[PDB]
C-alpha cells in the first residue's frame, strides 16, 4: 500500500495444507516493514 | 538536529585554502564559476 509516499508491507506466513485456491479461516496480516520510498507506483511484477 | 530532510548529499572534493571561500552561495571565481557552483538559494552547509 502507498499512503503519503510511505510504502508499507503487511504480511503473515501461515503453515497450510492446500493445492488450489485460498484456504478458509481468518488470519490478520501483521505489519512487516514500512519503506519511505516517497515515489508513485502503478504497476508491478513477480520474481521466480 | 531539529530538522529533517528527504535526503542529504555529501559533495566531497579537495581545493586550495585561498579557494575555500569559493564554496559559498553567490561566490564567483575559478572554483565557484568553473568547478563547483552553489545556488544562492542554498539550504546546506560547507565543511572544510
Amino acid at each position: 500500500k502507498n499512503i503519503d509516499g510511505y510504502f508499507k508491507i503487511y504480511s503473515k506466513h501461515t503453515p497450510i495444507n492446500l493445492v488450489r485456491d485460498l484456504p478458509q479461516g481468518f488470519s490478520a496480516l501483521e505489519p512487516l516493514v514500512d519503506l519511505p520510498i516517497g515515489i508513485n507506483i502503478t504497476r508491478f511484477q513477480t520474481l521466480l | 538536529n531539529d530538522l529533517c530532510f528527504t535526503n542529504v548529499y555529501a559533495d566531497s572534493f579537495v581545493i586550495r585554502g585561498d579557494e575555500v571561500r569559493q564554496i559559498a552561495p553567490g561566490q564567483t571565481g575559478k572554483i565557484a564559476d568553473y568547478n563547483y557552483k552553489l545556488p544562492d538559494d542554498f539550504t546546506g552547509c560547507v565543511i572544510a
Partner: protein, 198 residues
C-alpha cells in the same frame, strides 16, 4: 610577484649556459612563461615561450634549434639553455610571465606579457674582463676601461642622489666601455667583482 633571473655573464662565442628564472608570488603552473631579448640600446626581441613541458615550445625564427626553454614547477623556475651562441645575442634577457588563463570576474593581463623580471645581461664575446678605472672630472667621475657593461656607478654610495646624471657607456676602439657620473664615487663592477671608492 617577482621574477629573478640568474646566469647572465661572460660567454665565449659558440658557448653554452643556462638562465634560471625563479618566480615567486604567483601560482607558477597556471601562467605561461617567456624569455624576451633586448640588445643594448635596441628594441625587445622575443626569445621563446612555454606553458607545459610536454606541450609545444615556441621559439623565435632566429633562435630555433640553438635555444631550449623548460620549466620546473616544483622549483617555480624557468630555465633557458642557450648553446652555440652567436654574436648578435649579446643582450639583456627578461623573464616575463605570460598569463593565458583568464577567469570570469578576475580580469588579468590575459595573453599580455604581465610581469617582467629585472633581466640579466649576457655578453657573447671572447674578450676577457678588465677592472674599471675611475677618472674624476658640477663634480664628476669617469669610469673608463671596464668590460663588460653594466657597471653600477653612484655618488657617495647613494647618499647624494639629486642631480646624478649617468650617460650610457660607449663602445671604444679598444672595445672597452666608459661612463661618468656628474652632479666620493662608488663604482661596482659585478662581472669583475670590484668595488671602488674614489
Amino acid at each position: 610577484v617577482q621574477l629573478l633571473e640568474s646566469g647572465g655573464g661572460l660567454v665565449q662565442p659558440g658557448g653554452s649556459l643556462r638562465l634560471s628564472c625563479a618566480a615567486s608570488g604567483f601560482t607558477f603552473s597556471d601562467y605561461a612563461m617567456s624569455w624576451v631579448r633586448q640588445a643594448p640600446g635596441k628594441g625587445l626581441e622575443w626569445v621563446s615561450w612555454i606553458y607545459s613541458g610536454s606541450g609545444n615550445k615556441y621559439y623565435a625564427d632566429s633562435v630555433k634549434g640553438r635555444f631550449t626553454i623548460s620549466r620546473d614547477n616544483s622549483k617555480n623556475t624557468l630555465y633557458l639553455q642557450m648553446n652555440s651562441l652567436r654574436a648578435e645575442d649579446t643582450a639583456v634577457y627578461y623573464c616575463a610571465r605570460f598569463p593565458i588563463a583568464r577567469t570570469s570576474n578576475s580580469q588579468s593581463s590575459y595573453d599580455g606579457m604581465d610581469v617582467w623580471g629585472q633581466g640579466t645581461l649576457v655578453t657573447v664575446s671572447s674578450a676577457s674582463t678588465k677592472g674599471p678605472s675611475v677618472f674624476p672630472l658640477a663634480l664628476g667621475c669617469l669610469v673608463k676601461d671596464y668590460f663588460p657593461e653594466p657597471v653600477t656607478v653612484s655618488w657617495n654610495s647613494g647618499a647624494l642622489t639629486s642631480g646624478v646624471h649617468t650617460f650610457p657607456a660607449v663602445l671604444q676602439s679598444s672595445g672597452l666601455y666608459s661612463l661618468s657620473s656628474v652632479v666620493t664615487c662608488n663604482v661596482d663592477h659585478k662581472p669583475s667583482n670590484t668595488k671602488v671608492d674614489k
